[PDB]
Amino acid sequence: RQLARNWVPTASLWGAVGAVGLVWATDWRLILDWVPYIN
Amino acid sequence: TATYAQALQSVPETQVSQLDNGLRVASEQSSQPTCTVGVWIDAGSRYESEKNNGAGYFVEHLAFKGTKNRPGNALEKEVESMGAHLNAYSTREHTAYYIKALSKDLPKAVELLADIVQNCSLEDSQIEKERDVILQELQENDTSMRDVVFNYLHATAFQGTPLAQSVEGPSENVRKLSRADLTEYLSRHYKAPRMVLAAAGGLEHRQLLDLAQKHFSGLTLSPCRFTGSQICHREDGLPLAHVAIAVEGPGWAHPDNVALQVANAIIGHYDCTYGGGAHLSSPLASIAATNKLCQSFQTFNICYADTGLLGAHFVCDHMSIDDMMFVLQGQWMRLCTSATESEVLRGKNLLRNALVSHLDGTTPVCEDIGRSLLTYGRRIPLAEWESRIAEVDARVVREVCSKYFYDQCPAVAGFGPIEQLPDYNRIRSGMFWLRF
Amino acid sequence: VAPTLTARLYSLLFRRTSTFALTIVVGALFFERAFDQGADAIYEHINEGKLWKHIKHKYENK
Numbered sequence: 001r002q003l004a005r006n007w008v009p010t011a012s013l014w015g016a017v018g019a020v021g022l023v024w025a026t027d028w029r030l031i032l033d034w035v036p037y038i039n
Numbered sequence: 040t041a042t043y044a045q046a047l048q049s050v051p052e053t054q055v056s057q058l059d060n061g062l063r064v065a066s067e068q069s070s071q072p073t074c075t076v077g078v079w080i081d082a083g084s085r086y087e088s089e090k091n092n093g094a095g096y097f098v099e100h101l102a103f104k105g106t107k108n109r110p111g112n113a114l115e116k117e118v119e120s121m122g123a124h125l126n127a128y129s130t131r132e133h134t135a136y137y138i139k140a141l142s143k144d145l146p147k148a149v150e151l152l153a154d155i156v157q158n159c160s161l162e163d164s165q166i167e168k169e170r171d172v173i174l175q176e177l178q179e180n181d182t183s184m185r186d187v188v189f190n191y192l193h194a195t196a197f198q199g200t201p202l203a204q205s206v207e208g209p210s211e212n213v214r215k216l217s218r219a220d221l222t223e224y225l226s227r228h229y230k231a232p233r234m235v236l237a238a239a240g241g242l243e244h245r246q247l248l249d250l251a252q253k254h255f256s257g258l259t260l261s262p263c264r265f266t267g268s269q270i271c272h273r274e275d276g277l278p279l280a281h282v283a284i285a286v287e288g289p290g291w292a293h294p295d296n297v298a299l300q301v302a303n304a305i306i307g308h309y310d311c312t313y314g315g316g317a318h319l320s321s322p323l324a325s326i327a328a329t330n331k332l333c334q335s336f337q338t339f340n341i342c343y344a345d346t347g348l349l350g351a352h353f354v355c356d357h358m359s360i361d362d363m364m365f366v367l368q369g370q371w372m373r374l375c376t377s378a379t380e381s382e383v384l385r386g387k388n389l390l391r392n393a394l395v396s397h398l399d400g401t402t403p404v405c406e407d408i409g410r411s412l413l414t415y416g417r418r419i420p421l422a423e424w425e426s427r428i429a430e431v432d433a434r435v436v437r438e439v440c441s442k443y444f445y446d447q448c449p450a451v452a453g454f455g456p457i458e459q460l461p462d463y464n465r466i467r468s469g470m471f472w473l474r475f
Numbered sequence: 476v477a478p479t480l481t482a483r484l485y486s487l488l489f490r491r492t493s494t495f496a497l498t499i500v501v502g503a504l505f506f507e508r509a510f511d512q513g514a515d516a517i518y519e520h521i522n523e524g525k526l527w528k529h530i531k532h533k534y535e536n537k
Contacts, residue, residue, distance in 0.1 A: 001379075005376060005379070006376045007376070010376075010493060013491075013497055014493065017493070020500050020504075024500055036508060037508060446490065474492060474493065
């Protein structure tokens with residue numbers, strides 16, 4: 001039509017997931033310490 | 040004229056009157072030569088004890104066996120003298136005694152009727168006769184599988200509540216039953232305000248109440264537990280296996296009860312015998328005709344005082360069971376998220392039609408009042424129902440169904456040859472999508 | 476009467492499986508940052524002066 005229903009907010013979270021995931025993985029960008037990260 | 044907006048406007052309105060001892064009076068004038076004369080009583084099995092179980096049911100037959108002033112079979116020989124049909128029936132939450140008649144001889148009718156309500160001949164001649172027929176019928180009752188599974192259905196959800204119990208009650212009680220205990224329940228719940236009276240026809244309100252005419256009317260419940268569970272009667276001989284599945288819902292009086300009226304109408308129903316074929320709009324009636332995954336099914340709603348029942352009842356091949364299901368969870372689940380306002384409309388229209396449809400005819404008009412009184416009181420918010428219809432929204436239905444469907448504990452009833460039917464633990468995981 | 480955090484929590488998070496999934500990584504992150512940081516102390520608490528971390532101070536940069 002196109003009506004994209006709660007899929008929109010749904011999907012909104014999803015990308016955030018594995019993005020964090022790769023961030024959780026190892027990635028490149030450090031991540032300003034923010035609770036202790038070793039020196 | 041007839042124009043839908045104006046069509047709501049001109050109707051004979053709800054009437055009400057109240058006598059002293061708790062009797063209710065009410066009416067509507069249909070400008071008709073005939074009148075449905077009826078009575079509705081809220082005394083339930085949910086009132087009935089463990090011996091009283093099925094007694095009122097047994098009682099139900101008895102009234103017409105003769106009464107105090109009118110011994111055996113002197114009762115109807117006056118009734119059919121007029122040529123007026125007569126009928127009575129009962130229910131877990133209600134009992135309705137009623138008459139369909141010409142407005143002329145009504146002065147007898149209620150007076151005939153009033154006699155019956157309380158004055159009764161309790162005669163073990165009829166008792167044993169009726170004690171037998173019921174017993175005779177008790178066993179015969181295995182012939183219609185429909186009613187059968189529902190009995191299982193309640194008992195599995197409402198276990199531990201008088202609501203969960205057989206209407207006719209277990210058998211042995213009927214033998215053990217004695218008409219004194221009746222006289223109890225006769226005396227107990229047949230008082231007013233429990234009693235309620237209504238009628239519709241050429242009858243005007245006051246010409247009802249005046250001839251409501253001095254006779255008499257009269258001088259406990261609990262919220263029920265809801266059981267995530269399963270029941271199965273496995274018998275593989277039979278050709279087909281019914282299924283019922285449901286979750287509990289709001290009572291009679293509750294806002295959302297109407298909001299969920301449409302979701303059913305939208306998801307609709309299918310049967311072997313339609314001429315609709317595979318081009319119907321209902322995804323179910325499309326597929327279930329396409330691959331004939333079932334013989335037929337229909338969805339129900341039953342809202343108790345405090346409770347409500349939403350689910351369907353289907354019949355499918357002993358090898359076709361799974362696939363009906365995996366479909367059926369599709370529809371409910373997809374509604375809760377991805378539904379759309381278009382299909383809302385097609386649902387919206389239907390319920391308007393069905394609403395307006397049932398409203399024709401003396402008795403049904405007469406009949407609404409009694410429960411409605413026992414339910415919402417006088418309220419027959421006819422034109423309001425329309426306004427009520429305008430209330431429902433896309434978010435509404437989603438937001439409503441989100442409550443009562445997504446990630447819940449469903450009830451499962453079954454009747455053989457079930458075996459294919461997956462274990463609960465599938466159905467449960469199958470309630471909540473994983474986003475698929 | 477207020478709901479126990481449980482009644483809050485599902486309604487808040489566990490209801491939508493994404494969220495239910497989402498939080499999982501989230502705490503798991505903060506978890507390890509703190510978690511490993513604790514055990515090593517406990518570890519090195521247990522072994523005192525057996526490790527250069529304690530020992531090497533004797534001779535480290537002279």
